[PDB]
Protein: protein (hemoglobin)
Organism: Homo sapiens
Amino acid sequence: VLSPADKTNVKAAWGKVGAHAGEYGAEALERMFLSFPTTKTYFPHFDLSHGSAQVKGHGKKVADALTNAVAHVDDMPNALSALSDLHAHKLRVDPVNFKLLSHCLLVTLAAHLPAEFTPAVHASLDKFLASVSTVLTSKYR
Amino acid sequence: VLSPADKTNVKAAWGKVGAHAGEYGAEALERMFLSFPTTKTYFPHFDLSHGSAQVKGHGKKVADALTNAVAHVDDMPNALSALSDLHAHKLRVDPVNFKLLSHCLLVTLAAHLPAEFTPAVHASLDKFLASVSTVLTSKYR
Amino acid sequence: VHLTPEEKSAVTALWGKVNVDEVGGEALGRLLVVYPWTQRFFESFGDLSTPDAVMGNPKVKAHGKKVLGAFSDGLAHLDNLKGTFATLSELHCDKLHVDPENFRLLGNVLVCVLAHHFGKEFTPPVQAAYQKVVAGVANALAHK
Amino acid sequence: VHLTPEEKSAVTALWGKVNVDEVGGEALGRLLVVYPWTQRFFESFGDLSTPDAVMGNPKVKAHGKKVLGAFSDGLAHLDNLKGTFATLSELHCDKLHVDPENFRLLGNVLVCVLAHHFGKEFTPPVQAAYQKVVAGVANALAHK
Ligand code: HEM
Ligand code: HEM
Ligand code: HEM
Ligand code: HEM
């Protein structure tokens, strides 16, 4: 459960990303692929090479979904229902993987927004990502 | 996130608990303390012996809180706000402890209501307890 | 794992009543139902569409029997779980890439199944002994 | 933990540039802020009422250096982490009863602090090497 301050923190931080969305998204995936090789097993037919256009494209998609989540923070399950279907019902992604991507996203944000990545903001983002993860790993339809 | 059928399953199974809620909550605690001794660290002021009056009394409060959660399944955050404040803010209960109690709760129910404890109900209860756990471990007020 | 003689006796007495052709299938089925992502590992098993499909699946039951055989094996080698489960650890970790959290989950679902089948006999103290056993097994499997 | 020669160099080089006086306090502070149940173990540290209070607490900055010092010992003996953290394992498990999942959380928070500090220098490959170290340390602490 996010507090009012959490939502505000997330909106402020995420808002900074801007047109870098896809870039940060791609970087987060690459950090994941390198640090946690097992995750690659969910992308059997991908070109996962460094600077791959496939990963850049996917990074964009991931980032957009997060923007979507921020814009519907108070009613997430309805906004991301399509994504739950895919990850929970179709792909059946083990929840541990969401912790891995979440961590890689936090690392990406820390490396790019030094002034925004305060302890308080770090805390809010962690919670938000956990919230998103819960929705994508649930079957509530 | 709970699905419509999950909510139906919980209501139905908790309905069977009924007047036994208190003894079941007491048994769940006793089960947790014996099986996971580190949990006892949160109750240093308690007589944790078998049949302890304090445990009995305490199992009643827990079960009442769960009954209230079931009745407010679509609005847990608001209904459990005081409990959230106590466990997340004041007691600072490590989230792993909630998984332990939840497990002990499921064992108690399986033990007592074997006919009702079907795979589907088991899955619904697990999700419900995870949801309750999330609310109590969060600081959102 | 160290069990007091009292505990060993209790653990053993209950294990003696376990229906070996069934309990493992029940435990595995419930895992697939309660924690749905685990189905990803058993895509070859067929129809796992619903609890009914899962519980009635012939392959789940057959496999469940193999899982139970391993616990029985553990019960007999409590002082050497890591050596005993070496091969299984390698299989699950290195080849299947099962996250270690799932081993804990299967162990817990197994406890729920015993509780379900033995009700009154599955007392707190008996449960406490069984939790040590299943944590020991999960730990040996995650060794790799 | 086995790091390739390249990984070891990458790790040790970055480590020489870490402000030993401040990074530890930042990591510990963030743990307390981000996963607040962890504050329960540092009750004797004073005012952990707010992030600001946490971040500024002298006992937190002081303790932080101790923690980092432990990470350094690990780096110098990747060979024998278990042996190196034997005593610490004991303190944390036996006497403090800290859940092992919390060791992973701190290792991760340290990675975030490194990224925060080094910016673009903290590349994916550099991150990958560091993730092996923190997993190593976490496992060795949980050894007991
Ligand atoms: C914050 C967490 C995540 C978000 C927001 C997210 C978002 C998305 C989005 C937007 C898509 C594309 C769907 C479309 O084509 O419309 C997608 C696809 C996919 N995601 Fe994620 N995802 C997350 C976590 C994960 C994790 C942890 C994994 C596994 C390690 C994963 C594996 C995949 C796969 C395999 C696909 C499909 C690839 C394809 O065939 O195009 N996702 N995700
Ligand atoms: C299903 C999840 C839980 C529920 C519904 C629950 C419910 C409650 C309730 C209703 C109270 C007393 C409220 C009052 O009258 O002030 C309470 C107090 C308490 N709970 Fe829980 N609890 C849960 C999980 C836990 C866990 C996992 C732990 C730690 C192992 C824990 C430790 C405590 C402690 C230490 C107290 C204060 C007792 C006292 O000093 O009187 N609770 N809880
Ligand atoms: C306490 C935990 C577990 C025990 C004791 C156990 C035991 C076993 C045994 C005895 C086998 C047969 C290996 C052989 O062919 O000799 C096996 C295979 C297998 N297990 Fe498990 N297992 C456990 C947990 C899990 C979990 C949690 C998963 C996934 C969620 C899993 C997935 C598999 C798979 C995919 C196979 C291979 C199936 C095949 O042969 O096609 N296991 N396990
Ligand atoms: C990678 C993880 C960790 C490392 C390397 C580490 C290291 C250390 C060290 C070197 C000490 C000082 C012992 C002494 O010489 O007095 C210590 C003490 C302590 N640690 Fe940690 N620690 C870790 C994680 C944790 C976590 C996650 C917690 C709990 C949230 C924790 C709680 C404590 C406490 C309460 C003490 C107090 C001992 C005293 O009073 O000196 N530690 N730790």
User: Anything to note?
Assistant: The domain at 1-144 of chain D is CATH 1.10.490.10 (Globin-like). Chains D and C do not touch (no CB pair under 8 Å). Residues 58-76 of chain D form the longest helix (19 residues).
